[PDB]
């Protein structure tokens, strides 16, 4: 079973692909995998995708 990581974005980031999800400056995202350069995340909209949101801090 994969472990989920709870983090909060500090700056707005735009998805680099159509399968990824856009985030905001103060938007909380649900990470699924941070081992890869690209991180998989989930949103309150029930959508999930891989976004290398380097502009996010763990909390």
Curated annotation (Swiss-Prot):
Residues 2-59 form the SH3 domain. Ubiquitous. It is found in: Cytoplasm; Endoplasmic reticulum. Coiled coil: none annotated. The modification N-acetylthreonine is found at residue 2. Interacts with DOCK1, LIMS1 and TGFB1I1. Part of a complex containing PPP1R15B, PP1 and NCK2. Interacts with FASLG. Interacts with AXL. Interacts with PAK1, PKN2 and SOS1. Interacts (via SH2 domain) with EGFR. Interacts (via SH2 domain) with DDR1. Interacts with IRS1. Adapter protein which associates with tyrosine-phosphorylated growth factor receptors or their cellular substrates. Maintains low levels of EIF2S1 phosphorylation by promoting its dephosphorylation by PP1. Plays a role in ELK1-dependent transcriptional activation in response to activated Ras signaling. This is Cytoplasmic protein NCK2. The chain holds residues 1 to 59 of 380 of the full protein.
């Amino acid at each position: 079973m994969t472990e989920e990581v709870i983090v909060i974005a500090k700056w707005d980031y735009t998805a680099q692909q159509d399968q990824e999800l856009d985030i905001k400056k103060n938007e909380r995202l649900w990470l699924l995998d941070d081992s890869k350069t690209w991180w998989r995340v989930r949103n309150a909209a029930n959508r999930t995708g891989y976004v290398p949101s380097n502009y996010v801090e763990r909390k």
